[PDB]
Ligand binder design. Structure first.
Ligand SMILES: [Zn+2]
Length: 610
C-alpha cells in the first residue's frame, strides 16, 4: 500500500495488514504473514491491528522517509502508542520506532520470513559467545532454552542484535538501539525448515516509558564476519568500543594479563542450613577450608613445576565463606590465616611474578549479612522485595545497585588498609545476570541505571589501578571491563550430552576480541571436543585450574601453547572467522597481524600459521 524508495533501499508497508517488507541490492525481506505485531498482558495477547482507531501518515524529513502509525483503544481500554518506520537517507538503514503516548511485553517488529528451506541459510544469535543456526538444524531452539529468556545485556544476549544470512550472501542485522528493557525471541523447530527471530520489549518500572528503536541494515556479499563488523562499527561510532589499548593507556598493567594461565580456587566453603545446597541429613558435607598457607604452597609448587606466568583469582577468602554474608564480606577468614596469611599469599605471588585478584559479590544481599537492612534492598515494580535461598549463604534479596558503589568503596578500602594491593578484582554476576529495576523511593532505579551503577563499581577499581573482571561479557560493560571469568559458548554451559543449538562461532570476539581479555575452559570431553581448540580459535588465555563454585604437567604443556598465542594476539582484533570450505567442523580464525588458527574438529587438532 505505502511504498518508499531512498538511497538504494525500498520499504513497503501495508496499511491494512501492518506487514512490511524491505529490499536492497536486489534482495527482498518480508515480515512473516500470520505473525502480527503484539502486546501482551498476563496470559493473553493483542494484535496492534486490534486497536479501535488506526491512522497512518506518510512522512519525509531532512533525514529520511517513511510511515508514522498511531494506535488507540484496546477493548474500550485507553491505551495509545505510535510506530514510525523509515528509511535513513544517509545510509539506507531502516529504523523502526515504538513510541509510547500514555503491558507486560511488546513483540515488535514482527519477525522476518526466513523459511527459504535451504541448508546454508542461517540465523546468528548472541546467546553467549555465539550461535550459527542453519535452517535445517535438527535440534529445536526456542526462547525458553536461551539463558535469561533472550534478554539483551545478559548471557542470553551478549550483544543487542541478531541477524539472518541467506546462502547467497544477502543478509540483514537487526540492532536494538534501546536494549535495557529488551530481548529477542527465537523459534527454530527441530529440523526447520524456518527460523524466526524478533525483538521484545518490556516496561521500565511498570510503564513503557521511553521510545524503543531497532535499526535494520541490509547487506550483500555478507558472511558472519561481515555481519559482526557491522555491529563493531556501530558501537565505535557511538563511543563504546573501548579497546584494551585505551584501557592500558590508563592502567598499563592491562598488558600484564597477556599470556597468563588462570588459577581459580577457594578458601572457605560454608553452606547454611537454609541453602538449597544444604543436606540436613549430612550437616558437615559441603563445609570446607583450605588455608591461605596451603594456597601459598600451591602457587610456589606450580611455579617450581614450570607453570609460567599465572593469575590467581581467589574465592571464599572472607570470614562468612563463599556466597555468605555479602556485602559484609569481611574480614579475611581467621581460620584460613587472616589478613596476615592473605597478605603472605599475595606477597608470595608477587615475589614469583604472578598476579592476584579476589572474588567478591555485590548483588546478592544475604539476610545473615552483619548489616542487613531491607531498606537497602530492591523493590520490584509491584512493591515486593524479592527473596530466595538458593546459594550457600541461604536467605537473600538483592542489594539495589544505586548503593553498590558505596559498599565496594567501603570494602575495598578496608582490604587496602591491611597492605593488600590487588592486581585485579572479580565482581561476580554483574556481567552475566540482568540489571535489576527498583521502585524503592529511597533509591529508585531503572535497568539502564543498574548497568551504569555496576559500571561505576568497575570504575572505582580501575581508578585505583585494579583491573576489573566479572562473570561473563554482556556488552554494556565493555567500557569498564578488562576481563572475565569466561566468555564461553552456550554448549560449554550445558552437559556435553545435550544436543547443541547450532554451530559455534566467535561472534562476540569478532566484535570485541581487542577490548576484553578472556580465559577459556581447557576441559577434554571424553568421546568429544577438546575445549583447548576453542581457546585457540578465540585467541584466549587458558585455565590451568578452574574450581567451579558448586560441585598438571600435561595441563602446563597445553596451557603454554594457548598462552603463547595469547601473548602475541591477546590485544589484537580478531579480523576473520570462517568455516573452511563451509565445513562447520573445520574452523579458521585470523588475527590483525595475519596469525591464522585452524582447528579441525574431525581430527581434534590445531595448527597455527599465517
Ligand atoms: Zn533501589
Amino acid at each position: 500500500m505505502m511504498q518508499f524508495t531512498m538511497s538504494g533501499t525500498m520499504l513497503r508497508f501495508d496499511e491494512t495488514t501492518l506487514r512490511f517488507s524491505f529490499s536492497r541490492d536486489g534482495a527482498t525481506w518480508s515480515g512473516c504473514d500470520g505473525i502480527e505485531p503484539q502486546l501482551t498482558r498476563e496470559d493473553r495477547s493483542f494484535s496492534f491491528a486490534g486497536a479501535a482507531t488506526v491512522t497512518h501518515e506518510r512522512i519525509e524529513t531532512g533525514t529520511g522517509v517513511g510511515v508514522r502509525s498511531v494506535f488507540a483503544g484496546f477493548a474500550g481500554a485507553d491505551y495509545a502508542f505510535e510506530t514510525y518506520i523509515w528509511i535513513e537517507r544517509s545510509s539506507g538503514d531502516v529504523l523502526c520506532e515504538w513510541v509510547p503516548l500514555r503491558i507486560d511485553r511488546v513483540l515488535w517488529p514482527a519477525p522476518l520470513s526466513f523459511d527459504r528451506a535451504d541448508a546454508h541459510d542461517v540465523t546468528l544469535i548472541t546467546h553467549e559467545q555465539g550461535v550459527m543456526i542453519p535452517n535445517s538444524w535438527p535440534t529445536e531452539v526456542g526462547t525458553d532454552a536461551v539463558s535469561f529468556g533472550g534478554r539483551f545485556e545478559t548471557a542470553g544476549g551478549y550483544m543487542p542484535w541478531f541477524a539472518q544470512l541467506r546462502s547467497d550472501g544477502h543478509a540483514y542485522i537487526a540492532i536494538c538501539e534501546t536494549p535495557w528493557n529488551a530481548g529477542y525471541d527465537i523459534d527454530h523447530p527441530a529440523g526447520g525448515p524456518y527460523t524466526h527471530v524478533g525483538m521484545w520489549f518490556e516496561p521500565s518500572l511498570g510503564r513503557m516509558d521511553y521510545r524503543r528503536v531497532v535499526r535494520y541494515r541490509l547487506l550483500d556479499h555478507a558472511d558472519h564476519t561481515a555481519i559482526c563488523k557491522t555491529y563493531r562499527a556501530y558501537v565505535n561510532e557511538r563511543g563504546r568500543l573501548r579497546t584494551l589499548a585505551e584501557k592500558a593507556a590508563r592502567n598499563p598493567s592491562v598488558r600484564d594479563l597477556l599470556g597468563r594461565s588462570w588459577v581459580a580456587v577457594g578458601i572457605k566453603t560454608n553452606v547454611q542450613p537454609d541453602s538449597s545446597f544444604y543436606d540436613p541429613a549430612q550437616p558437615g558435607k559441603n563445609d570446607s577450608l583450605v588455608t591461605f598457607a596451603q594456597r601459598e604452597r600451591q602457587m610456589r609448587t606450580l611455579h617450581e613445576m614450570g607453570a609460567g606466568r599465572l593469575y590467581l583469582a581467589l574465592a571464599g577468602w572472607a570470614q562468612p565463606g563463599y556466597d555468605n554474608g555479602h556485602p559484609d564480606y569481611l574480614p579475611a577468614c581467621r581460620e584460613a590465616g587472616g589478613w596476615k596469611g592473605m597478605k603472605s599469599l599475595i606477597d608470595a605471588c608477587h615475589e614469583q611474578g604472578d598476579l592476584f585478584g579476589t572474588a567478591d559479590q555485590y548483588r546478592d544481599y544475604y539476610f545473615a549479612a552483619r548489616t542487613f537492612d531491607p531498606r537497602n534492598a530492591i523493590r520490584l515494580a509491584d512493591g515486593t522485595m524479592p527473596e530466595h535461598a538458593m546459594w550457600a549463604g541461604g536467605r537473600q534479596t538483592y542489594l539495589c545497585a544505586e548503593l553498590a558503589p558505596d559498599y565496594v568503596r567501603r570494602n575495598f578500602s578496608e582490604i587496602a588498609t591491611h597492605g593488600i594491593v590487588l592486581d585485579c578484582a572479580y565482581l561476580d554476576v554483574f556481567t552475566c545476570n540482568e540489571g535489576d529495576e527498583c521502585s524503592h523511593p529511597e533509591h529508585r532505579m531503572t535497568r539502564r541505571e543498574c548497568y551504569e551503577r555496576r559500571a561505576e563499581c568497575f570504575e572505582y577499581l580501575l581508578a585505583h589501578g585494579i583491573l576489573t573482571s566479572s562473570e561473563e561479557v554482556s556488552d554494556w560493560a565493555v567500557p569498564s571491563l578488562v576481563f572475565c571469568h569466561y566468555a564461553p559458548y552456550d554448549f560449554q554451559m550445558r552437559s556435553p550430552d545435550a544436543p547443541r543449538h547450532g554451530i559455534p562461532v566467535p561472534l562476540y570476539n569478532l566484535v570485541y576480541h581487542d577490548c576484553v581479555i578472556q580465559p577459556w575452559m581447557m576441559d577434554r570431553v571424553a568421546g568429544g571436543d577438546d575445549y583447548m581448540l576453542y581457546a585457540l580459535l578465540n585467541g584466549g588465555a587458558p585455565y590451568l585450574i578452574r574450581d567451579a563454585a558448586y560441585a598438571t604437567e600435561n595441563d602446563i604443556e597445553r596451557c603454554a601453547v594457548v598462552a603463547g598465542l595469547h601473548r602475541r594476539v591477546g590485544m589484537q582484533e580478531l579480523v576473520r572467522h570462517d568455516l573452511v570450505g563451509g565445513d562447520p567442523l573445520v574452523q579458521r580464525s585470523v588475527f590483525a597481524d595475519g596469525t591464522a588458527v585452524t582447528c579441525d574438529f574431525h581430527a581434534q587438532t590445531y595448527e597455527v600459521a599465517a
